[PDB]
Design a protein around this ligand. Structure first.
Ligand SMILES: [Mg+2]
Ligand SMILES: [Mg+2]
Ligand SMILES: [Mg+2]
Ligand SMILES: [Mg+2]
Ligand SMILES: [Mg+2]
Ligand SMILES: [Mg+2]
Ligand SMILES: [Mg+2]
Ligand SMILES: [Mg+2]
Ligand SMILES: [Mg+2]
Ligand SMILES: [Mg+2]
Ligand SMILES: [Mg+2]
Ligand SMILES: [Mg+2]
Ligand SMILES: [Mg+2]
Ligand SMILES: [Mg+2]
Ligand SMILES: [Mg+2]
Ligand SMILES: [Mg+2]
Lengths: 132, 132, 198, 208, 101, 99
RNA sequence: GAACAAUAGUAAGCACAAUCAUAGCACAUAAAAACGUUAGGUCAAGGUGUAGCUUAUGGGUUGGAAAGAAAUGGGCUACAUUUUCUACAUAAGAAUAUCCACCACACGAAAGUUUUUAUGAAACUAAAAACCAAAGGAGGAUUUAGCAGUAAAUCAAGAA
């Protein structure tokens, strides 16, 4: 959201750069790594973005030329879906809170189905267990 | 009631050619096309020209061979030449038939500026498909 | 028995419905008694045999490719959508449709459930690994297409009895329902222009 | 009707096909099913082998749907079930062990029970006699009654909410109020029942 | 004889419009251009509005060629809808047929 | 956008023979006007009609030379003959109104 | 002018039916649908009978054809929350006729006013902006359509 394109407009209807914004201009200085004693942990996003396609999760696509070039050497940590153990643990956590109220959700069947429909993606699994 | 190009049922005595006994919805199903030329195909040109030419040929032939025309004309167009093919009643002496063949072919050749062939098929009486 | 048409062809004569009926009833009376040899031969001119009745499918021969074992193919068609699905028996559960994950390509729950139907039906839900090519139609039509194709591909891996089960669940039949043509003088292929009485 | 009358409806149930060996008449029956060389309609997109799908929830989903939006109506249903769920989880933790034994947290059972309570017993049909239209008490088929319930629910939680208020909110409210029999829907059911008693004499005009 | 006086009018129109096409084009070049000064363009304006009124193409009508009908024409055969049907239904239009689907 | 890109583009146009110097949207029409065949010049336009004079004249003459036979014109004739006989004809020019 | 356990009916023909089309079946749809009925519609598609005009009821040129007291048909867009805006495919952020003291203000502008643009010899024609934001808060008697890939909603292309 720092180096991207901005939706907000002047009364001229003319769009404004993210540079033009005081909050962004200053929040840019905080990421430049000029200083000592600190650590900047960042997250590149889709869900809230602007002008980015829905299927783009990759850092250089979301950040663009400006973003990735002005972002310097950084550590690219990848966040993936639940593995079998993570998944089974989350399901068990829901059962412990008795948040799965469907009679057949206590079977192995129910687990195979939730695993398939959610592709054991955490947000998707939460959505599927919310109305269940 | 659709009336187009139909020969209505009479008291049951009416002689009817194979052509006349088939209503327009049978074209390309049972009876075929009285003309053939490239013009109506997808990517092709000068349909209009060939249509007018056609109309004039039917009229012309009908007037040049009075009373002896059996069925409607057949017009085949191939690589710049038109072969007209006709069903003719035997009325005239072959003198008059050859006179008119030559006269026509030359006349139309000079009119439409392309080689014109004329093919006469001779018939005792109107071929009868139905009733009668 | 012969049809009336056949009998009518065998006597070189027109017949009536009650005629045909009479005759057939008589042959019935005949066959219901002790059958002589010349009698059996007699009534058997009036026999025809109805051709093969079996609806059993034609199993795709399973296929072994480039040191890889056990992959089968199937092709679904639904409503302007075509789908070609290749399934590997040797893999874990995942599905790649047009080179991407099936959770990405089919955002809607309903379509993922459609893709799930045949596997969940055969309890193969963890055991197979599939690649797909689907074109045309909308999202739901594509889900339907892949559904059918997947179903048809999984028939190589399963027992002949479960094939009959999938058919009886309506998994193996193409869905004939397709968009009707709009008709001139109407609005919607059924919907009519508003009709004013007076 | 792109299917000839020859085509039978499919049976989606997995349990039916998995455990055949204990039933004679049914073995004979589905033997006659497939062996009849019987054609089968292709299983519809809505219906699944899913262990999670309630045909009543799906019907309701459909009756809620405007235009062609399943996505939107399935959204609103999903959200409503989640909302009833969380409303009851709220009512559970602010309660005491007795009421923690009493209160129902399964949104499905709540949906069902709330519909069973809201379905009318008896009904009214207009009958013309001597140039007058009398309203007459008529016994109703099961399907007609379930329909009347669902339709009344949706009609109310479409119509009577304040425009600021979202659908899954109002619907979860009315589901829970009809669970306990105090909902306006139930008042409608009673208006019918009372109109049916007021006219009970006219029950003679019914010829069927 | 053209089938109708109107058709005659139209023939004339197409002739004139063919004749002055070059003048009209050359002038409307000037007229449609931002690069030249307005003073040239006003003179050029009177220039093209000087030209005979029946030389301008918008005054042309595509008419049925046999029957002279002013509308209900199909451009490809230059034929009235009625005459078109009359030819096609006797099957004198090659490759044309009723449509079932 | 750069100066490099613009120099490149100018070179591309000059090479392929498209418009060199920058023009308005409104002026490009001029190029269009000379790129095309002006509407009144297309054979679909000035040649639209068959010449009806040539068809009518030629087939009339060929009727009088007794080659072509026109039943329509014959019908018209015989009707007209029978009409002048019955006494209703076409008035010689100038005669009808005042007389 | 039939009775099938048959009592006076045979009948060719045309319709129906069958086939053909919608690229495999099937189903559906399309197409087809006689004889007649309504002196139904059209002399202005063209052609024509009868009767009419002929220095005109014919042929040309130039310019005009307005308009809304009122009534009404069919559509379009709406009246919003299953909504409106922006991003974007379907997990987002915001707006939300009411807040409150005070404006301001939700949904609805397809209408008008100004400025542009396209086409054209000619702009009155169509389109895009900016301003403007009205009636409309789901409609009386009475009414139309639809049996499934239909109704409903959404998108696109073509003919001239
Ligand atoms: Mg519709
Ligand atoms: Mg005329
Ligand atoms: Mg025009
Ligand atoms: Mg007969
Ligand atoms: Mg067929
Ligand atoms: Mg059929
Ligand atoms: Mg029809
Ligand atoms: Mg038929
Ligand atoms: Mg009349
Ligand atoms: Mg009239
Ligand atoms: Mg006339
Ligand atoms: Mg009006
Ligand atoms: Mg209309
Ligand atoms: Mg507004
Ligand atoms: Mg809007
Ligand atoms: Mg202009």
């Amino acid at each position: 959201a720092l180096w991207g394109r901005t939706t907000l407009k002047r009364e001229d209807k003319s769009p404004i750069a993210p540079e033009e914004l005081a909050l962004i201009h200053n929040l840019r200085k905080m990421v430049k790594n000029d200083w000592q004693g600190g650590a900047i942990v960042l997250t590149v996003s889709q869900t809230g973005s602007l002008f980015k396609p829905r299927n783009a999760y990759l850092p250089q696509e979301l950040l663009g030329k400006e973003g990735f070039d002005a972002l310097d050497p950084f550590i690219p940590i990848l966040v993936s879906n639940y593995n079998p153990k993570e998944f089974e643990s989350c399901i068990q956590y829901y059962l412990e809170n008795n948040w799965l109220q469907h009679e057949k959700a206590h079977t192995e069947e129910g687990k195979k189905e939730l695993l398939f429909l959610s592709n054991r993606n955490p947000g998707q699994l939460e959505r599927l267990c919310a109305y269940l | 009631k659709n009336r187009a190009a139909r020969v209505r049922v009479s008291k049951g005595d009416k002689p009817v050619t194979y052509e006349e006994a088939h209503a327009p919805h049978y074209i390309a199903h049972r009876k075929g096309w009285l003309s053939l030329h490239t013009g109506n195909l997808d990517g092709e040109d000068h349909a209009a020209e060939r249509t007018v030419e056609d109309v004039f040929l039917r009229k012309f032939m009908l007037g040049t061979f009075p009373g002896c025309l059996a069925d409607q004309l057949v017009l085949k167009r191939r690589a710049n030449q038109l072969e007209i093919c006709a069903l003719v009643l035997r009325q005239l002496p072959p003198h008059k038939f050859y006179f008119l063949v030559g006269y026509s072919e030359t006349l139309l050749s000079h009119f439409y500026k392309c080689p014109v062939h004329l093919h006469l098929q001779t018939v005792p009486s109107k071929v009868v498909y139905k009733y009668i | 028995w012969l049809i009336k048409e056949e009998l009518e062809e065998m006597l070189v004569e027109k017949l009536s419905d009650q005629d045909y009926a009479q005759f057939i009833r008589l042959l019935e009376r005949l066959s219901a008694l002790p059958c002589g040899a010349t009698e059996e031969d007699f009534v058997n001119r009036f026999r025809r045999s109805i051709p093969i009745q079996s609806k059993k499918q034609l199993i795709e021969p399973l296929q072994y490719d480039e040191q890889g074992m056990a992959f089968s193919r199937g092709e679904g068609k639904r409503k302007t959508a075509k789908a070609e699905v290749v399934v590997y028996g040797q893999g874990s559960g995942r599905i790649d449709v047009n080179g991407v994950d099936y959770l990405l390509y089919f955002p809607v729950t309903q379509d993922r459930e459609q893709l799930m139907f045949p596997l969940h039906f055969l309890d193969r839900l963890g055991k197979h690994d599939m690649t797909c090519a689907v074109s045309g139609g909308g999202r739901s039509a594509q889900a339907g297409a892949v559904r059918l194709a997947m179903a048809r591909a999984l028939c190589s891996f399963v027992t002949e009895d479960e094939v009959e089960w999938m058919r009886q669940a309506g998994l193996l039949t193409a869905d004939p329902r397709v968009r009707e043509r709009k008709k001139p003088g109407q609005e919607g292929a059924r919907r009519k222009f508003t009709w004013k009485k007076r | 009707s792109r299917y000839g009358p020859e085509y039978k409806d499919p049976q989606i149930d997995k349990e039916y096909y998995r455990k055949p060996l204990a039933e004679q008449t049914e073995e004979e029956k589905y033997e006659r099913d497939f062996k009849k060389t019987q054609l089968i309609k292709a299983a519809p997109a809505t219906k699944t082998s899913s262990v999670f799908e309630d045909p009543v929830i799906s019907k309701f989903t459909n009756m809620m749907m405007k235009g062609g939006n399943k996505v939107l109506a399935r959204s609103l249903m999903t959200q409503t079930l989640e909302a009833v769920k969380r409303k009851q989880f709220a009512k559970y933790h602010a309660a005491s062990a007795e009421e923690q034994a009493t209160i129902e947290r399964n949104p499905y059972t709540i949906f069902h029970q709330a519909l069973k309570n809201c379905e009318p017993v008896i009904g009214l049909v207009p009958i013309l006699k001597g140039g007058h239209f009398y309203q007459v008490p008529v016994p109703l088929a099961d399907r007609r009654r379930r329909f009347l319930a669902m339709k009344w629910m949706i009609a109310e939680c479409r119509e009577k909410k304040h425009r600021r208020v979202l659908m899954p909110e109002k619907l979860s409210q009315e589901l829970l109020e009809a669970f306990h029999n105090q909902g306006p829907v139930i008042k409608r059911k009673h208006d019918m029942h009372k109109m049916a008693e007021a006219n009970r004499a006219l029950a003679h005009y019914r010829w069927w | 004889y053209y089938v109708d006086w109107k058709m005659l009018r139209d023939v004339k129109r197409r002739k004139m419009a063919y004749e002055y096409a070059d003048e009209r084009l050359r002038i409307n070049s000037l007229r449609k251009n931002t690069i030249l000064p307005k003073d040239l363009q006003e003179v050029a304006d009177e220039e093209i509005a000087s030209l005979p009124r029946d030389s301008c193409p918008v005054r042309i009508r595509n008419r049925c060629v046999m029957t002279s009908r002013p509308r209900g024409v199909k451009r490809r055969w230059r034929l009235s809808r009625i005459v078109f049907r009359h030819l096609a239904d006797h099957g004198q239009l090659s490759g044309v047929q009723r449509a079932m689907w | 956008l750069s100066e490099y890109a613009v120099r490149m583009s100018r070179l591309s146009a000059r090479l392929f023979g498209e418009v060199a110097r920058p023009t308005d949207s409104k002026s490009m029409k001029v190029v269009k006007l000379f790129s095309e065949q002006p509407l009144a010049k297309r054979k679909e336009t000035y040649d639209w009609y068959p010449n009806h004079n040539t068809y009518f004249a030629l087939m009339g003459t060929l009727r009088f030379l007794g080659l072509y036979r026109d039943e329509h014109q014959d019908f018209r004739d015989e009707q007209l003959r029978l009409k002048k006989l019955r006494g209703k004809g076409k008035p010689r020019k100038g005669e009808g109104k005042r007389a």
